[PDB]
Design a protein around this ligand. Structure first.
Ligand SMILES: Nc1ncnc2c1ncn2[C@@H]1O[C@H](COP(=O)(O)OP(=O)(O)OP(=O)(O)O)[C@@H](O)[C@H]1O
Length: 327
């Protein structure tokens, strides 16, 4: 069968903890007052929740209320526990309350509001300096949650709220986050298609924090090359072919050989043979101002098939790409 794997950092953080920290099913939810919140407008709806802009009538502050659908209502304790564990951490969204919605009869999570700009408009305006600055801010959130024994598992532009006017960032939507336990086999049906790491695409279940670093590399490549998304798969199978057209098939086969993974035979007729492309292939007159030797080297060290080879969040923060960012 497959060769096992472990994180190279923060490996044993959860085993030292009292079970209270990570045994989310044993957690007793403290409920707030639903009447403190007045819903203002519906912001969105997904398969797992309905999201509303609301006002906290006790302090007249704007908040966001995520009312969980019955399908997400099952693993609510995991999201609550993770949000409470990470509360106050750098660039982590603050969970302000947990109330019972009177209409849905399901839990409603109340978060602080962030004045975000949709990435489809915002990413087009970012300068080279801004991409470095905001990437460093995301890394602070990722190193914090990883150091706390938690993988986000859904890093993508829609889950990074940026108040560009105030140069403030928050990492949101912890509904897919999970506690890392060495040797644990996890569900590969996590993250969004274009941000899924090769470990998920080849059905390797013993993954870790490094999944988030692949997703972050996908965001970086889209930002510096002005190509949204960078790996534009039509489905989860074509997603791996798109990756292989850039990183090459030889390193893909070495990755699966190292972990003794057997690729789904449906890849035999679609993967082909591709060499690794040099990152300069993606540079053109319209994105050249966002590209530097440091950006390319940093990206090259995130976008690796082997999850164990990728930079950790703390190693990423040490990279020369961030030397120009004021700290
Ligand atoms: N804390 C928050 N502050 C402000 N806006 C928020 C906050 N949390 C979520 N939102 C906004 O709520 C809206 C609906 O959220 P939702 O997750 O359902 O959709 P989405 O952002 O398009 O994500 P997805 O790509 O996963 O479908 C989005 O416009 C999102 O930016």
């Amino acid at each position: 069968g497959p060769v096992p794997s472990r994180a190279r950092v923060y490996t044993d953080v959860n085993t030292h903890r009292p079970s209270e920290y990570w045994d989310y099913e044993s957690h007793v939810v403290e409920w707030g007052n639903q009447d403190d919140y007045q819903l203002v407008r519906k912001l969105g709806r997904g398969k797992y929740s309905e999201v509303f802009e609301a006002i906290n009538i006790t302090n007249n502050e704007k908040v966001v209320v995520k009312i969980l659908k019955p399908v997400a209502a099952a693993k609510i304790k995991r999201e609550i526990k993770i949000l409470e564990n990470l509360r106050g951490g750098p660039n982590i969204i603050t969970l302000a309350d947990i109330v019972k919605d009177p209409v849905s009869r399901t839990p409603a999570l109340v978060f602080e509001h962030v004045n975000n700009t949709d990435f489809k408009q915002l990413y087009q305006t970012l300068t080279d300096y801004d991409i470095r600055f905001y990437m460093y801010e995301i890394l602070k959130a990722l190193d914090y949650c990883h150091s706390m024994g938690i993988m986000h598992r859904d890093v993508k532009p829609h889950n990074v709220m940026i108040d560009h006017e105030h140069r403030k960032l928050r990492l949101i939507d912890w509904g897919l986050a999970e506690f890392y336990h060495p040797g644990q086999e996890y569900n590969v049906r996590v993250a969004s298609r274009y941000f899924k790491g090769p470990e998920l695409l080849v059905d390797y279940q013993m993954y870790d924090y490094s999944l988030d670093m692949w997703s972050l590399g996908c965001m970086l490549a889209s930002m510096i090359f002005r190509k949204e998304p960078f790996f534009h798969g039509h489905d989860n199978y074509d997603q791996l072919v798109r990756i292989a057209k850039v990183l090459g098939t030889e390193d893909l086969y070495d990755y699966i050989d190292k972990y003794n993974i057997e690729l789904d035979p449906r890849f035999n007729d679609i993967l082909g043979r591709h060499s690794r492309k040099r990152w300069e292939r993606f540079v053109h007159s319209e994105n050249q101002h966002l590209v530097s030797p440091e950006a390319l080297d940093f990206l090259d060290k995130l976008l690796r098939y082997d999850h164990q080879s990728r930079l950790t969040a703390r190693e990423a923060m040490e990279h020369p790409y961030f030397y120009t960012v004021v700290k």
